[PDB]
């Protein structure tokens, strides 16, 4: 969707990697984190999958 | 043995509040989010509420949204519902479930025996 | 709001066949959609969730597929215990939604 894409473009320009790899291995800031933005499931899978590409980048 | 035991429910004019409760036993209340369904005379199954394992979320279906309050007291294990501006079309078996913890939203693992509620003139 | 189309609305069947209950949303849910099933006198109980996990104590015969938009839960060799009342969800996002219902009846 477009709403992935704009959490793909804020994750880029405007997070540091060590910021994105601390809500990537830490369940409780991920869950904090999909919960703040109610997010869908499916969508929170996606972009979990996605940011997860991104990071290893 | 989980334990879900529902309250408060019974006979309210158009446009009255009543306030159900629900008290919980067999596990740990303080770490689940819970849910409030209600089937109606037509046994159609609807949404109502839920809140988030510490209140710190509230979410409310759209029929809803802006009358019902739900609540919680995880001191006293007890789950709560204060309606108001009731309608006819509220008129259900009112159910307390637990959500399964894999996500913030979640199915229904454990359901209690129900609340009849009634609005009428 | 999901909507979600279960179909069908009832069912005629003999105990030892096997019975397939659709269930179509209005938008893609990936795998999570549970399946609940209604007795007279007893609570709701959760048969699966997440489209094909069994939860646990529910019979093997019980067996759900799909992921997306189309799901299906197959009951196997029916049990005289299994004629009631079967419902399905999403659990994808708020509003819970639900599927109309499907009144599992006996066939004479």
């Known amino acids: 969707s477009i709403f992935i894409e704009d959490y793909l473009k804020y994750f880029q320009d405007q997070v540091s990697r060590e910021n994105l790899l601390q809500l990537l291995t830490d369940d409780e800031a991920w869950n904090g984190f999909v919960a703040a933005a109610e997010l869908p499931r499916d969508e929170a899978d996606e972009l979990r999958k996605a940011l997860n590409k991104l990071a290893s980048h | 043995e989980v334990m879900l035991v529902e309250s408060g429910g019974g006979l309210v004019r158009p446009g009255g509040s009543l306030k159900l409760s629900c008290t919980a036993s067999?596990?740990?209340?303080?770490?689940?989010?819970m849910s409030w369904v209600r089937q109606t005379p037509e046994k159609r199954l609807e949404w109502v509420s839920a809140i988030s394992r510490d209140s710190t979320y509230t979410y409310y279906s759209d029929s809803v949204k802006g009358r019902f309050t739900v609540s919680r007291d995880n001191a006293k294990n007890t789950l709560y519902l204060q309606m108001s501006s009731l309608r006819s079309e509220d008129t259900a078996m009112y159910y307390c479930?637990?959500?399964?913890?894999?996500?913030?939203?979640?199915?229904?693992?454990?359901w209690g025996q129900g609340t009849s509620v009634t609005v009428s003139s | 709001d999901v909507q979600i189309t279960q179909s069908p609305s009832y069912l005629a069947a003999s105990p030892g066949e096997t019975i397939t209950i659709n269930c179509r949303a209005s938008?893609?849910?990936?795998?999570?959609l549970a399946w609940y099933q209604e007795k007279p006198g007893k609570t709701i109980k959760l048969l699966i969730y997440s489209g094909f996990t069994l939860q646990s104590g529910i019979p093997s015969r019980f067996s759900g597929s799909g992921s997306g938009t189309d799901f299906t839960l197959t009951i196997s060799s029916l049990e005289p215990e299994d004629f009631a009342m079967y419902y399905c969800?999403?659990?994808?996002?708020?509003?819970?939604?639900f599927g109309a219902g499907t009144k599992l009846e006996i066939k004479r």
């Open positions: 938008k893609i849910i990936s795998k999570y």
């Open positions: 067999g596990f740990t209340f303080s770490r689940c989010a």
């Open positions: 479930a637990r959500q399964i913890d894999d996500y913030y939203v979640d199915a229904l693992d454990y």
């Open positions: 969800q999403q659990h994808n996002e708020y509003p819970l939604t």
